[PDB]
């Protein structure tokens, strides 16, 4: 066995030889080996999976260099190792796929005249892991991302990358703990890489290209699936809610809502004071490039507001936070709630109303933003309360009709969901999608 050095958490900690962390707006290695980290002028910091993350744009000043300490300098020459990091890449437009689809550029590398070592690179919608030994011998894992960009890994969402290397067998590439690619690597000689690990866009012809990298980490062993699962989920801090992209959910920000259980649906409004329902979102398809996705940014815009002042006006929404949900329609904001004795399906599934204002009729609008299930998904649940603080249920949808309107999946609040929180798919899970430069519909 060529690994180094029991409890999984202990193994993960002990086998870590490099761990980039960001505190006090400074990037440093907290592995204990103290490899020095050189941050260049245009390396930017942006919201991360748990704190801030490294943001790299396409210019010479945007880079972070890690100078390996002598104690780990030659750790991957003959022995096993694993590289892990959260990664976020913008969805590549149809135009850029045609124009730059064949341009392979590295983003993380240990390769310097022959360039032995390893590298993480991107080519169009392909994520590539490369190992090169001192003889120029090469081994690669090429991962072709899913055609459906709504579910793809290189389409603007934070995803967790993990690449294990067993010198006696093969290299395996994982995304969110799932095996996506592999390549036998036996027959490789010594790996003589550069003294530095460089995080930078190298040889990228698209000047507007950028990537985000977080928690860059290296282990001195080839992690097994169980360890990778624990590693991955260890970053999903359940106290802070996240938006569709994996970034922190924020107050006073416009979001489009999409039900996780019917991701091809957008939310629409019947009329002010009335109900909301689902409609099919338009879609984009390109046979030539073999890509497609339900288009985003259509439907109602929702805004989350603090029910009462939080900590120190923190901009991020915490699980357990009480809020007021509003719909921003024609520049006017209307609160979402359930009026006393309001129409409901079989007196159990309370039909939500937007901007309801019948005089003398109490409107229950106090909600709680929570994370009760599906840790790996960037979704949120919303619990509505009445005036006595009793639960009116979780926001979801119910199929049926109102008056003579067509059959529709109508937005409601129901306690029914609390008895099915273990289901794989549940109608009370919601994606909060904010407009982002990393995703423009073609």
């Amino acid at each position: 066995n060529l690994d180094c050095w029991e409890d999984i958490d202990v193994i993960l900690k002990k086998s870590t030889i490099l761990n980039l962390d960001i505190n006090n707006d400074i990037i440093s290695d907290i592995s204990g080996f103290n490899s020095s980290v050189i941050t260049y002028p245009d390396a930017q910091l942006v919201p991360g999976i748990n704190g801030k993350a490294i943001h790299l744009v396409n210019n010479e000043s945007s880079e972070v260099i890690v100078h390996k300490a002598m104690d780990i300098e030659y750790n991957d020459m003959f022995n096993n190792f694993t590289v892990s990091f959260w990664l976020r890449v913008p969805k590549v437009s149809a135009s850029h796929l045609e124009q730059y689809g064949t341009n392979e550029y590295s983003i993380i590398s240990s390769m310097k005249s022959i360039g032995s070592g390893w590298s993480v690179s991107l080519k169009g919608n392909n994520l590539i892991w490369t190992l090169k030994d001192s003889a120029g011998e090469v081994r690669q894992i090429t991962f072709r991302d899913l055609p459906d960009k709504f579910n793809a890994y290189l389409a603007n969402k934070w995803v967790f990358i993990t690449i294990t290397n067993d010198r006696l067998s093969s290299a395996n590439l994982y995304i969110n703990g799932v095996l996506m690619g592999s390549a036998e690597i036996t027959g490789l000689g010594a790996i003589r890489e550069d003294n530095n690990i460089t995080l930078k866009l190298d040889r990228c012809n698209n000047n507007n290209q950028y990537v985000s990298i977080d928690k860059f980490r290296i282990f001195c062993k080839a992690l097994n699936p169980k360890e990778i699962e624990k590693l991955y989920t260890s970053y999903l801090s359940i106290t802070f809610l996240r938006d569709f992209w994996g970034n922190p959910l924020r107050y006073d920000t416009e979001y489009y809502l999409i039900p996780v259980a019917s991701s091809s649906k957008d939310v629409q409004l019947k009329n002010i004071t009335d109900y909301m329902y689902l409609t099919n979102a338009p879609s984009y398809t390109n046979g030539k490039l073999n890509i497609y996705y339900r288009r985003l940014y259509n439907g109602l815009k929702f805004i989350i507001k603090r029910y009462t002042p939080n900590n120190e006006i923190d901009s991020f929404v915490k699980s357990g936070d009480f809020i007021k949900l509003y719909v921003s329609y024609n520049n006017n904001e209307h609160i979402v709630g359930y009026p006393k004795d309001g129409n409901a399906f079989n007196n159990l599934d309370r039909i939500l109303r937007v901007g309801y204002n019948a005089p003398g009729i109490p409107l229950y609008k106090k909600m709680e933003a929570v994370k009760l299930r599906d840790l790996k998904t960037y979704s949120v649940q919303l619990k509505l309360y009445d005036d006595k603080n009793a639960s009116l249920g979780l926001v979801g949808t119910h199929n049926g009709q109102i008056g003579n309107d067509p059959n529709r999946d109508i937005l409601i609040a129901s306690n029914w969901y609390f008895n099915h929180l273990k289901d794989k798919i549940l109608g009370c899970d919601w994606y909060f999608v904010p407009t982002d430069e990393g995703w423009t519909n073609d």
Side-chain angles (χ1 to χ4, degrees):
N1 172 289
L2 295 173
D3 294 318
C4 52
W5 182 72
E6 182 62 291
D7 186 62
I8 291 63
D9 296 297
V10 179
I11 298 176
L12 288 174
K13 177 183 181 183
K14 290 187 174 181
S15 56
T16 297
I17 58 177
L18 176 56
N19 194 341
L20 295 189
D21 185 33
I22 303 176
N23 298 301
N24 307 308
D25 299 322
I26 291 296
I27 305 175
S28 71
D29 166 37
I30 58 171
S31 63
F33 284 105
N34 296 307
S35 290
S36 70
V37 181
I38 305 297
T39 302
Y40 284 66
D42 213 14
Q44 295 158 33
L45 292 192
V46 299
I49 196 66
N50 182 52
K52 291 189 185 181
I54 305 174
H55 187 64
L56 303 179
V57 293
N58 198 8
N59 72 59
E60 305 306 305
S61 292
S62 195
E63 78 176 313
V64 180
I65 297 177
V66 179
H67 184 70
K68 293 136 55 187
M70 299 182 94
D71 306 296
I72 70 163
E73 202 194 325
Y74 312 127
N75 182 293
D76 77 337
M77 186 170 282
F78 298 108
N79 301 298
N80 297 175
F81 67 108
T82 292
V83 176
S84 64
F85 54 99
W86 283 82
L87 170 71
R88 190 189 182 207
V89 175
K91 176 180 64 65
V92 186
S93 66
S95 298
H96 287 172
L97 280 177
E98 301 174 303
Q99 186 168 184
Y100 304 113
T102 68
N103 173 44
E104 180 179 349
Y105 59 100
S106 299
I107 53 171
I108 310 174
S109 175
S110 70
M111 310 172 154
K112 177 62 179 59
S113 198
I114 195 201
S116 177
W118 54 264
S119 67
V120 174
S121 63
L122 293 159
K123 183 179 70 169
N125 284 146
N126 299 299
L127 175 60
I128 303 164
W129 170 250
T130 307
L131 292 179
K132 176 180 290 183
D133 74 17
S134 61
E137 190 64 20
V138 168
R139 288 294 185 287
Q140 293 186 299
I141 295 178
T142 298
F143 174 67
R144 280 79 168 183
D145 201 18
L146 302 180
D148 187 340
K149 304 318 174 182
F150 186 79
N151 296 306
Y153 303 105
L154 310 180
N156 216 214
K157 296 195 188 70
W158 274 109
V159 299
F160 188 58
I161 307 300
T162 308
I163 305 157
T164 65
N165 298 273
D166 183 337
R167 297 306 301 270
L168 297 182
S169 57
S170 62
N172 294 282
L173 181 169
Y174 303 75
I175 300 187
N176 292 348
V178 175
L179 183 68
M180 299 298 174
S182 178
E184 196 175 307
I185 60 179
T186 52
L188 290 178
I191 291 183
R192 297 175 180 294
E193 68 191 16
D194 181 51
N195 199 305
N196 296 312
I197 292 179
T198 306
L199 282 70
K200 172 189 181 182
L201 309 204
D202 181 57
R203 296 180 182 179
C204 177
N205 301 321
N206 182 354
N207 286 311
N208 300 315
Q209 181 65 237
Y210 59 73
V211 304
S212 295
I213 300 165
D214 199 10
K215 316 301 180 185
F216 184 67
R217 191 168 176 177
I218 303 178
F219 302 80
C220 51
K221 73 168 294 188
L223 303 179
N224 60 215
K226 289 186 178 181
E227 303 174 319
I228 298 176
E229 182 62 8
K230 194 75 172 60
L231 208 210
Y232 170 46
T233 59
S234 78
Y235 292 111
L236 308 173
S237 56
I238 329 171
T239 61
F240 312 83
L241 305 175
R242 309 184 194 298
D243 62 25
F244 183 69
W245 310 121
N247 287 319
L249 234 210
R250 311 283 187 182
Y251 281 105
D252 312 318
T253 303
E254 301 186 330
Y255 291 109
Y256 290 94
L257 284 181
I258 300 186
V260 179
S262 305
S263 67
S264 70
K265 309 279 187 177
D266 286 332
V267 181
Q268 181 59 77
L269 178 66
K270 171 69 187 305
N271 273 310
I272 294 299
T273 79
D274 224 339
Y275 70 97
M276 297 174 278
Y277 60 97
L278 307 181
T279 61
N280 299 313
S283 61
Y284 174 74
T285 69
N286 186 304
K288 180 185 186 298
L289 306 172
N290 185 37
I291 68 166
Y292 65 92
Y293 50 79
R294 56 97 81 210
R295 303 171 68 88
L296 301 176
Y297 316 138
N298 284 298
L300 304 177
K301 297 180 185 58
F302 293 80
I303 294 174
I304 305 175
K305 290 187 179 176
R306 310 162 202 291
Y307 191 72
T308 55
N310 62 166
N311 186 193
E312 300 190 300
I313 316 177
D314 284 315
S315 60
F316 55 101
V317 184
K318 296 148 297 302
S319 179
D321 271 9
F322 290 109
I323 68 178
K324 281 181 178 183
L325 186 61
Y326 291 79
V327 169
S328 186
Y329 196 76
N330 295 323
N331 207 183
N332 302 318
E333 307 186 328
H334 310 84
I335 189 135
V336 177
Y338 173 66
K340 184 181 185 180
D341 294 319
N343 185 10
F345 291 103
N346 200 39
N347 294 62
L348 291 166
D349 310 314
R350 291 115 192 159
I351 297 159
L352 299 186
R353 302 291 270 282
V354 179
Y356 182 94
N357 50 43
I361 299 185
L363 178 71
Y364 308 128
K365 49 181 163 293
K366 175 179 176 179
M367 287 189 199
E368 190 190 344
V370 296
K371 181 64 175 174
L372 273 37
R373 42 164 286 115
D374 205 359
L375 182 67
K376 303 175 180 178
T377 304
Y378 304 142
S379 57
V380 178
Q381 291 81 46
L382 300 169
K383 184 179 183 183
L384 184 63
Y385 292 78
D386 66 13
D387 42 25
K388 312 115 59 195
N389 290 314
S391 176
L392 284 178
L394 294 179
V395 177
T397 58
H398 184 81
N399 183 268
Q401 38 282 303
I402 291 176
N404 283 296
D405 287 344
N407 172 264
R408 286 164 172 169
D409 293 306
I410 302 159
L411 270 295
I412 51 76
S414 173
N415 285 304
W416 178 88
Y417 295 112
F418 286 112
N419 190 49
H420 301 79
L421 296 180
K422 292 178 182 303
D423 296 357
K424 64 180 182 182
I425 309 303
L426 201 55
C428 61
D429 294 347
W430 298 90
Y431 289 128
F432 276 64
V433 189
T435 57
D436 187 279
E437 62 184 303
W439 181 304
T440 292
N441 299 314
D442 293 301

